[model samples]
Target: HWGYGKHNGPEHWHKDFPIAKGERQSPVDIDTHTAKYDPSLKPLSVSYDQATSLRILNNGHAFNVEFDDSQDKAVLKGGPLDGTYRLIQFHFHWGSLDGQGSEHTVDKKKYAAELHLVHWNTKYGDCGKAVQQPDGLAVLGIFLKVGSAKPGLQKVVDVLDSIKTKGKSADFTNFDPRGLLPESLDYWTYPGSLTTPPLLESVTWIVLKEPISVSSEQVLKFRKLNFNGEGEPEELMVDNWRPAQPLKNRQIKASFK
Candidate 1:
């Protein structure tokens, strides 16, 4: 039963590794009535401190960004998420195509897209080894909805020139990542697992209640991301999202209190 024909769908994920069965997962339904709810979400005045720079990466999955934490702008302040959480990387989750494009949803409705700003606990020495600790991760979840347009994400589309050719990566030298933040800082926090494989139950999920808007054009560029290549399933991996998994008696905590 162990074969590598096509690597698609959630069920196929744990075929070889049974631990996948007990892994903590993400994209959970945001339930407001959970016991772990904390409604006092204060927006933090965090700064990337110039330690935040963008780099295009063609890591076999879609073209993504690996932010350098050594930069300066990688600092953050204010809000419930305080302290130093080094910026590691940023990626997206989308539907197979246009119509369906979100990972986490309210009730059963999906959004246009989801962006993850991954960070880790500096207490673990550095972001490199933090991934191994269950309590060493903090992910900022941003929801993108289809709207009139979004210039905030322009920086993201501008870099497409580097990796648009597929199987290509380039150094995104002069890019500032501050604009990626939304106007409202109010957020929802919860204890969840990594959205990817080796899904450890170690993330303190901070999902902004408010969503930011991006231009339809920019959205299109995100959709063109090639996850599979060369005789592989060109299933159009633009919408690389994992559907909402069971909450497993877990309660979501919020900072809106």
Candidate 2:
């Protein structure tokens, strides 16, 4: 019922999830002109162990790579964070067509796609416990511009056919999430909610200023997956992204001046 379509899309999400209208909503349009530079903000320290990767699943919403977060083998820290946040999973939001896909826009412009790496604060012991706290989750957002064919990304795309339908998954291992990052880690940080519903307002968003490149043909691979499971009605999974929300009183702090 919560799929991104004319019936149950972003506009109707607020009806079910009352918190969608809350103060600190996420995927806000990033205005570089309005974003302030925070000198106190330090560089982000993102470390991941490829061996921790467990499986890639077509979760009916988006294809996500789940990690073994039992230990801090893959963790996110430093930028806009208090302590270590364990890397739980990573996913992408893309469009049916080119030019519009990313959930978070930059200066009112949409990118080809957006990649999100979700993590939980280790102090809380586990994700279920941590998610309730305001400081529980930290999500790293990376914009994907259409350009070169990324070898790292191709690895993930190669396995898409195996999990072509919703609720399907395949064993995905030894995949390094770090290779997906751009050369620069400069970003904009803010307090926000998850783009998807049960839109819990716990995420501390760290959106990268430098966008990594991906080819248009590669995005086509993502669109080929079915939103429906093998036996159900056939529906393509595309344009799985939420539009920007009201910024309200939150301030987006830039890591670079």
Candidate 3:
């Protein structure tokens, strides 16, 4: 009933969660040719703490870098959003190969992987409370292209081998996530949900147009992850992205000309 497979995967998720049939879903194909350039879209603002990284977690799905969202130090606001949203955790999505990763696409163009910075609207309290509000979450989607090794992500990558199995975590300290950003904050904004299960219609997706470049060997680090916990049979945690959903009359607004 799990595993991004033909069985109880994404499609069947709708069986229990009727919201999956909702119009506002996530991981859509951003048709750049048709996306409107909204001049009014304000510049993004970020204020991440220097000691933000708490640890790296293997949730049997993907590796997530947990953060210190205890306060507003990791605040991210502006740019298609209102109210302050504090960073909760960050994770990656990948396919079995470089050619098939990434959830949201640019005209169906696929990158090697995608990174998600999960946030919660502090106005509604913490994340679980915000899940009920439409403007509850803000997710930053960053694509990863296969090219030069990414220096910013290498810190997390070097420790991949140790955290290979599920239900495990390791310490990661004094690491600000801003170092992993592209040179420009140019992006596309749209209303969407979390790309995975219990797909609540809460997230406002801010997808960065420019992808961060990392080498194939670097991506290989994530390829060997295990969904099974230690002492159990090993199951590789590949194909970690949701396929592109139909736009369904959604507006994809670009921040740049």
Candidate 4:
């Protein structure tokens, strides 16, 4: 299986997954000065029911909070998206230290961590089929800063101890994803792919302009997660981020000035 260690890292992903070099790759460095500000972009429309949150699991890659996306219980629309996109899961990418973990950078400045709310377009019926098309997936990327404690995020952090090892999972519910977002819905939009393999180029990236806050103590709990399973030599879960890929012939549009 593919892991984020030295041998199976992002640098070597293209060898196994040919689409890793695809034109529309994700987690690119956002050059705000070069990004086009389009006044026509609509505000983001999001509605997520807290009851839709199902379970939380450490998938070895990252800790993901899965949602019951059977229906459009929690969905996203507007903001450079076509049709309704169902919320499937949400996860995070972070490093061992501050200012080094985010997959997407702004002016080449990396944030402490990054959050991804993965959604699939309902036009194609399901996530499996939607991923084969160009406009299948839409991911909302929120940067994480280390300063004040994020009250909304404490619920997620509190469950880390239960899923400290890979493949470990527990019930997680009544957690609204909206509380974790920044006040501003302003974002940078682009066409990209899954940051991890099989590196499909189907995601519409909507990265927020402002970052949410998390205290230093709270951030350390994320590091407590293990990439290895039970009885295996534990590997600290950090730097599970893909390097910024080259932006080729893609124009990044902004929802705000």
Give all candidate RMSDs, comma-separated: 3.2, 1.0, 1.3, 1.0
Worst 10 residues of 3 by lDDT: 1-10
User: What local distance difference test score does each model get?
Assistant: 0.68, 0.91, 0.88, 0.93
- The estimated TM-scores of all candidates read 0.85, 0.98, 0.96, 0.98
How many pairs of residues collide in model 1?
33
lDDT (Cα, tens digit) per residue for candidate 2, span 98-212:
7899999999999989999999999999999888889999999999988888778998999999999989999998888888989999999999988999899989999999999
Model 2 / residue 241 / CA error / Å: 0.3
Candidate 2, run of 10 with poorest lDDT:
42-51
**lDDT comparison, 1 vs 2, better candidate:** 2
Off by over 4 Å in 3: 49-51
Evaluation by TM-score, superior candidate among 1 and 4:
4
Ranking by lDDT: 4, 2, 3, 1
Pitting candidate 2 against candidate 3, the one with the higher TM-score is 2
Model 4 agreement with the true structure over 155-196: per-residue lDDT tens digits: 999999999999999999888898899998889999999999
Model 3: C-alpha RMSD to truth?
Answer: 1.3
lDDT of 4 at 220: 97
- Global Cα lDDT for candidate 2: 0.91
